[PDB]
Amino acid sequence: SPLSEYALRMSRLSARIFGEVARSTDSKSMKVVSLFSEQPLAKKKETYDWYPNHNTYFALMGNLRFLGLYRDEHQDFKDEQRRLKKLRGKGKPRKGEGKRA
């Protein structure tokens, strides 16, 4: 049914009290209220802190391994494969001195 003057003027009196939009606003223009009432996706802690600081973990554990307070079985395994590979003559070439000139 239609909204009579009493109904419409009461609705505006209510919106004025509850801090709602008081005017007649299109559905398109109600997005401005949504944009400024909701935290944006890029500002949510889930988004910007999605990853752990992989650099802190890799660096910190490497520093601890060199201080003797942490043991990396994986790295010790790789360190011996490089040592053996260098003896076999398959080691990494120096930069700028690769097979192709």
Partner: protein
């Protein structure tokens, strides 16, 4: 007719823990709480008791050294409310300009030799130094007797 509302009691944040602590007594069959509660790790003799604690204090100092020497890895703060005592410490002055304020920082950090150098440099330029600030320098020098504060490091 009017109801009488009781007057609210108030207490410190540690009051409840203190009340619960009062109930319990020392366990006669257990080692001091500092020592680990394992038969293999219980101090048999008085020499081990002190050695075991010094090893604990030594391990605490090894962690604090790493935290204070690689602070960039211990800077992300995920604790709400914020815990100040679990953040890396910085003791070296970060004010580079040679001003009475920079001298005040060194005095606050308690560096004795660096503060003397910047005080003399301030005198060399002749810039004004407050008597209260000049007294803060003497306090540090007089109390430590011209010697850098004792500390342990590599």
């Amino acid at each position: 007719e009017e109801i009488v509302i009781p007057k609210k009691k108030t207490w410190d944040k540690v009051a409840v823990l203190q009340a619960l602590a009062s109930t319990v007594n020392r366990d006669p069959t257990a080692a001091p709480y500092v020592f680990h509660d394992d038969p293999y790790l219980i101090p048999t003799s008085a020499l081990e008791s002190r050695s075991f604690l010094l090893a604990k204090k030594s391990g605490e100092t090894a962690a604090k050294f790493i935290i204070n020497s690689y602070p960039k890895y211990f800077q992300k703060d995920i604790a709400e409310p914020h815990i100040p005592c679990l953040m890396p410490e910085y003791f070296e002055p970060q004010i580079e300009d040679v001003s009475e304020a920079a001298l005040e920082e060194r005095i606050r950090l308690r560096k004795v030799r660096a503060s003397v150098d910047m005080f003399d440099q301030l005198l060399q330029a002749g810039t004004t130094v407050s008597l209260e600030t000049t007294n803060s320098l003497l306090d540090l020098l007089c109390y430590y007797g011209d010697q850098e504060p004792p500390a342990d490091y590599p």
